[model samples]
Target: MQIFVKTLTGKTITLEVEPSDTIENVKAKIQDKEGIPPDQQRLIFAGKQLEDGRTLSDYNIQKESTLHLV
Candidate 1:
């Protein structure tokens, strides 16, 4: 499945991911695509903060989930 990462600048990045993918994995992907550092990136889903070690499944993140990136 795929997820959407929207930034404060109103730009969105798309990622193809699996339920097994960790939140860190998503940050890495973002780093590769946008040159943002994982340490500086924060992810939020459904208004809940995500952590590095947690899997997408941990947050019940679904296909097309739009995560806020700051």
Candidate 2:
């Protein structure tokens, strides 16, 4: 599923990812778009921090769900 992301500065982006994609993988794509490295990213979704080893489906992330990166 594809998800939307919003940053601290209010910048937003849309990205396509699999339900099985890891948080680390999402961070990598964000790094490509926003130039923020994965190590520096804290991804939050549904009031929980997206763990690097966990998949999106683990968080119940659905289409258009917004993640915060700070």
Candidate 3:
């Protein structure tokens, strides 16, 4: 599945990852793409922090899901 993520800098990026991928995996991907360190990254969806161990499906993330970063 593919998910759309928006950075604190207002940059938008799309990632194609398995539905089983954890939020930590997503954070690593964002760190790789945007040069942000994992420890400094925070992902929010629907105005809540994304729990680290949860999968995208666990969060009900869809193909075009949008996430915010801070």
Candidate 4:
């Protein structure tokens, strides 16, 4: 699945992911693609804040989940 990481500059980066993928693991991938540290990132899905300990499944994140990167 593709998770779209949209930034404040109107830029977007896509990451490969799955429901079972831990949020921390996903952040690793995002670091390479977005160059934004996980600790500095605030990933939001469906207006809910996502923490590192959770999984995509925890938020019921869909295949094309669009996460706001702040």
Candidate 5:
């Protein structure tokens, strides 16, 4: 699956993902692409914060979904 991670400053980072990937895994990928530390990344979707232990499917996130990267 692919998703969009958008920043408040108007940048959008597109990521290719696996449904089995954990939030921590997503953060690691973001870090590799954007140089953002996992500890500093707070990924939010549908007004809820994503937990490191959870998988994308756990949140019902699908392809093309946009997540706020703060």
Candidate 6:
């Protein structure tokens, strides 16, 4: 499935990730794309830190769902 991602710096990225991809995997991908270390990255959804090991479907993310990077 395709997921839309946005960085805290206002940059947007689109990624094709499998349904089985974990949140940690997504974080690694984001780090690779943004050139930021995972330790310094924060993924927030609806103003809450995403639970580790959760998949996108677990959060009920639909088309155009946005994740803010901080």
lDDT of 5: 0.92
Candidates 2 and 5: which is better by lDDT? 5
lDDT values for all models: 0.93, 0.91, 0.88, 0.84, 0.92, 0.78
Q: List the residue pairs that clash in candidate 2.
A: none
Residue 38's lDDT within candidate 6 is 76
Tens-digit per-residue lDDT, 5-67, candidate 1: 998796999999999999999999999989999999999999999999999999999998899
TM-score of 3: 0.91
Candidate 5 lDDT over 1-70, as tens digits, reads: 9999997675999999999899999999989988989999999999989999999999999999999986
lDDT of 6: 0.78
- Higher-scoring candidate on lDDT, 1 or 4: 1
With candidate 3 superimposed using the best TM-score fit, by how many Å does residue 54's alpha carbon deviate from the native? 1.0
Where does candidate 6 stray beyond 4 Å?
none
* Candidate 4 whole-model C-alpha lDDT, 0 to 1: 0.84
Candidate 2 local lDDT, 11-66, one digit each (tens): 89899999999998999999999899888999899789788999999999999899
Off by over 4 Å in 4: none
Better model by TM-score: candidate 1 vs candidate 5: 1
Residue clash pairs of candidate 4: none
lDDT of 3 by residue, 1-70 (tens): 8888998878898998888899999999988898898888888887878889999888888788899987
Clash tally, candidates in order = 0, 0, 0, 0, 0, 0
Candidate No. with top lDDT: 1
| Evaluation by lDDT, superior candidate among 3 and 4 | 3
Q: Which residue ranges in model 3 land beyond 4 Å of their true spot?
A: none
TM-score of candidate 4 against the unseen true structure: 0.89
